[PDB]
Design a protein around this nucleic acid. Sequence first.
DNA 1: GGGCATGCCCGGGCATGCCC
DNA 2: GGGCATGCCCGGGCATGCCC
Lengths: 195, 195, 195, 195
Amino acid sequence: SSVPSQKTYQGSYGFRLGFLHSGTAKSVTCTYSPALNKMFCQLAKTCPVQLWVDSTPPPGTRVRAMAIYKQSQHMTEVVRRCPHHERCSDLAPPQHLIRVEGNLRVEYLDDRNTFRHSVVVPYEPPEVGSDCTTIHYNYMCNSSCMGGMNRRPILTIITLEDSSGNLLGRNSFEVRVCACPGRDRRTEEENLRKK
Amino acid sequence: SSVPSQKTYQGSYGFRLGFLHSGTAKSVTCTYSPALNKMFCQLAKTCPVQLWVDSTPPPGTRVRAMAIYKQSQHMTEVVRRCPHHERCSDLAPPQHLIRVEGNLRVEYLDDRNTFRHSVVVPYEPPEVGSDCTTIHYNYMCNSSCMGGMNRRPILTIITLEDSSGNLLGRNSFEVRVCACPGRDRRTEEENLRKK
Amino acid sequence: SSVPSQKTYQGSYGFRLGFLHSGTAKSVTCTYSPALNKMFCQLAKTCPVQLWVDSTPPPGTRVRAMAIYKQSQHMTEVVRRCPHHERCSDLAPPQHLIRVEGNLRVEYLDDRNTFRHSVVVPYEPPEVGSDCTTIHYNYMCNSSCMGGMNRRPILTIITLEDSSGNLLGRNSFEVRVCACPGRDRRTEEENLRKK
Amino acid sequence: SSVPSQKTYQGSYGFRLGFLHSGTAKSVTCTYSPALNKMFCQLAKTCPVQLWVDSTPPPGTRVRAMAIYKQSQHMTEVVRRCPHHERCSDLAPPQHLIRVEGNLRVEYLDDRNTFRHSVVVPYEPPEVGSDCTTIHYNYMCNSSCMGGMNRRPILTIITLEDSSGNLLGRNSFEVRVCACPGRDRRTEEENLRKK
DNA sequence: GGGCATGCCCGGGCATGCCC
DNA sequence: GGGCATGCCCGGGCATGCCC
Ligand SMILES: [Zn+2]
Ligand SMILES: [Zn+2]
Ligand SMILES: [Zn+2]
Ligand SMILES: [Zn+2]
């Protein structure tokens, strides 16, 4: 399938993503490495992503998430839930990797041409006095799942899009869904330093 | 379910919550830690919460209370009474965690969209010469109840809302419902200091 | 409810129960203490019980299992699944504690007078050259479950009964359903020796 | 599901299984440990099993093969192909673990009561001057496949059955389907000696 | 109020298909 | 064939309603 752009596009609204701290304890549920721009998280647990903007987006703006493989040689393959976690799946079709929890207006899409999956929620401006809005994503496979990601790293691309379809902002982060997010983040940062 | 705001909003009326002293004796029925902004109380016993405001709110103002899980990964789950304390329950539906005692005008609500529970009483201005009004809450499960809170900490969010539905003030506090509130408060304060 | 007999009755068929060895490693799935005549096992995992007899029972013989509380003061209370594990239960009614896995002819009974639960399977003589037959029981609550056993020890009574209803043999064993069967068996044997 | 007998039954025909030597080189395709009575083989590759008997069985005799889990706590679960290798499967239904290659008279069965899978071929007496007959089995999942065997050891039970359905002989062997059969056999034999 | 209970948490380390 | 991978196993120890 055709490859969506992953290139950062901060646009005129100064769109940026924020992530909590939660540190590097062995199986913390979700931890983000700024050095690697990489979230590390457990399957089927909340991943909070914050949306920051410099100016208010117009009414009807939507926030899309889609996963693509990071490596050149996998980039044209659609990222999907492996057959085991699809089967004993359960709103979200069981073939989608990324879900949003807690949003009565979530739309799950399958592109009719590229067959790529995405999940979309409306943009809501932060609470009357606050600095960002948070969306709760869930990844429903480990990166290692045989017959899904199969140990291939992915990027999640978050785009902010007006109701006309215009791209307003785009940012992406690498994701590793694993049993021990603290162990693995520390290992990868230390590999970056040594190698 | 969508997550209600927990962010403190003191608003134009200077809404604030007050709590008694009762100190830290092992099984005091209730005790509040200002250091941790946290209530330690026993199940099905009164928890006095005082409402302070700087100016009188308009007539028809209502005070709502609602529990949400504190940790990111539980935040989208609705807080409910466990099945044991619901079954041998008894005005308040048996699935609600928080009750108000002693208020002939109490309303128990289940949001038709979020399915979250709340309990609401009208705002009454303090007695002709007094400084705050007190509402008597009861929590009907221990934080540890298997199949309800399951040891997950909760926040109680108190909102002051006009009869039109406008948010006038909001404050929240963490709650631990346990058998020995004095032991546990002391333990947590001491954990805060060392760790 | 009236108390069923727990008294060992070896009868004319020389009915006796046998149990595997599996030793005392911390969370072994099921381990039996001959010193205490006590099986220690995890919830919803197989518990193999072997049936030994000196002479062949007649055709139509059935093997019943029923749980009763061990302590005098609880003996008249019916042993049942707690409300949490009944609710998210699922052949076996969700109120029964003991199930049999793997037996197309299992009958679950609720006594119309005593309201006690039992599960019954036909007696099958051992395989053409073998020494006992094995039935795979499952206990669907921990002994500690709040609103079910509530930390009260139970006995499981196994009776061998002819198709006319006559009691042919009866033996019983104490059960503790817990998260760490190896830890707990060792602890109890050591308590027996010291105290 | 009810558990089939795994007990060796050499019967009146002196039925026994034979296995090649192929030694312990790291990724040999198949290798058999007589010490552990265990087959170590790669997925979807031939596993030769020889059938030896002391007297010729009558005409119409059939040889059935079936997998059951070895550990007590898994024994009542039906052994099946995981969803990944079933989906991209392909005579043999894609849910069966064990196939026979090279036998125009193979029957694949699913028991209507136990739902267990088996594969059956007719017994052929050895070639006019030979000592055993060989059947070529294939296992279509690794023992480690997530959502199939999931790292649980299995036994393969081979039964020799007359055309009337009578059991004539039965023998079983443990199987580990893995990427490196020579490594793993050596490792397990060495674990047996020390531990 | 001092202290046991017991399902769960926690980091050290095995697993095993794959990489090199 | 030597060695990394990464979900899981494992025992030491915290938890917290209850016992004493
Ligand atoms: Zn998966
Ligand atoms: Zn409760
Ligand atoms: Zn239970
Ligand atoms: Zn497989």
